[PDB]
C-alpha cells in the first residue's frame, strides 16, 4: 500500500479530542496518512483511506442509531494499513475542478463534511468539498 502524509482544508482540521475532529481557522493541524486501497476506480475518483500520522486511528463510517456516522477508530498497526481495507474505512476520493470529495463506500452519497461555522466537528451526511495540502 502507498501512503502520503497530507492535510485538508475547507472551501483547517484539528484533533479536538481523543477520537474527534473539528474544523476551524488558523498551526496545530491534523496530519493524515492517506493510503490508496482496493475498490472501484473510474474518472477522477480513487479509493482512499484516511489515518492519522503516527496514530493508529482511521476514519470510518458506521450506523449509529440507524444513520451512517463518521468516527475515528482504533486499529492494530501490524494489520494496518492494508490494500483490502474494510468498506467502513473506504473513502471514494473525488476530484472535480480544483476540489476534493470523500464518499463513504459503505454508504454512497454520504460524505466527509464540515460546518460553515468555526470549531464544529467533522461529520458524515454544509461543506462537502475540500482542499489537500501534500507535505514532506
Amino acid at each position, epitope marked *: 500500500v502507498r501512503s502520503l502524509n497530507c492535510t485538508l482544508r475547507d472551501s483547517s482540521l484539528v484533533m479536538s479530542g481523543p477520537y474527534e475532529l473539528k474544523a476551524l481557522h488558523l498551526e496545530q493541524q491534523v496530519v493524515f496518512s492517506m493510503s490508496f486501497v482496493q475498490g472501484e476506480e473510474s474518472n477522477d475518483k480513487i479509493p482512499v483511506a484516511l489515518g492519522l500520522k503516527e496514530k493508529n486511528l482511521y476514519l470510518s463510517c458506521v450506523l449509529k442509531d440507524d444513520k451512517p456516522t463518521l*468516527q475515528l477508530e*482504533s486499529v492494530d498497526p501490524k494489520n494496518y494499513p492494508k490494500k483490502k481495507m474494510e468498506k467502513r474505512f473506504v473513502f471514494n476520493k473525488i476530484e472535480i475542478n480544483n476540489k476534493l470529495e470523500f464518499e463513504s463506500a459503505q454508504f454512497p452519497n454520504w460524505y466527509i463534511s464540515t460546518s460553515q461555522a468555526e470549531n464544529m466537528p467533522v461529520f458524515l451526511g454544509d461543506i462537502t468539498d475540500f482542499t489537500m495540502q501534500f507535505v514532506s
Partner: antibody
Amino acid sequence: EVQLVESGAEVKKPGESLKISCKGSGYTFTSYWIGWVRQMPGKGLEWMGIIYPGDSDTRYSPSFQGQVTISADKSISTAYLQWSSLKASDTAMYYCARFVSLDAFDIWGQGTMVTVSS
Amino acid sequence: EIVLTQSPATLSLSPGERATLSCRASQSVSSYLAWYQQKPGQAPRLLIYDASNRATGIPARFSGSGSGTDFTLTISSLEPEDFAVYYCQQRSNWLWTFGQGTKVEIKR
C-alpha cells in the same frame, strides 16, 4: 481476555519520588488512549490525565498539570504515572482505564493504593 | 466549564424496588454520557455508554436515558449486588469529568 494490570500497593514517605505502572494485554496498547483516575479515601473519581501510547500524546487535567507526569513504554505495553515529591494528600487509590471512541472508559485496572506517611 | 451533578447522594431503596438515579450537566452536552458502577472493594466498571447503551455483559435490568442536561440511570428491580456506588461521566474536548456519585443503599 482484554486486560489492564497495575502494579502493587505503595507505602511511601513524603518527599519521595514514585512511579506506578499500568500494563495492557489482549489488545493493541498503541491504538487506545489510557487515562489515570484518582480516588481519595471515601471520595469520588477524579480524572488526572490521558495518554495515547502510540505517540505518547499527553493531556492533563488543569488541576493536575505540573503535579504529575504520565508516560508510556510501547515496547512493554505500559503506561505510567509519577510524582517527584509525594505529599500525604496524594494518599489515594489510582486507577488506569482505557478510553474508547464510543466515549467511555471500557476497561479498568484493578487499582493501586498509594499511602504517603512518615 | 462543565460540571456533572448527581442526585441524590444516597438513594435508600428496598431490594426489588425500581431505582432512578439522576445526573445533571451544568450546560447542555451531547448524549455521550457514561455511567459506571463501583462495588465496594472494587474497581469501577462501565455500565452504560452514550446515555442509553448497555455495555457488554451488563444485565438487562440496567437502562439509561436522557439528553441535553438531564440524564438518568434506571435499574428496573434492584438485586443485592446492585447496591453500590454509581458515577456518571462525560468529556468535552480534552476535559473529562465525573459526577460526585450516588450510593444506592438498602432501605429496611
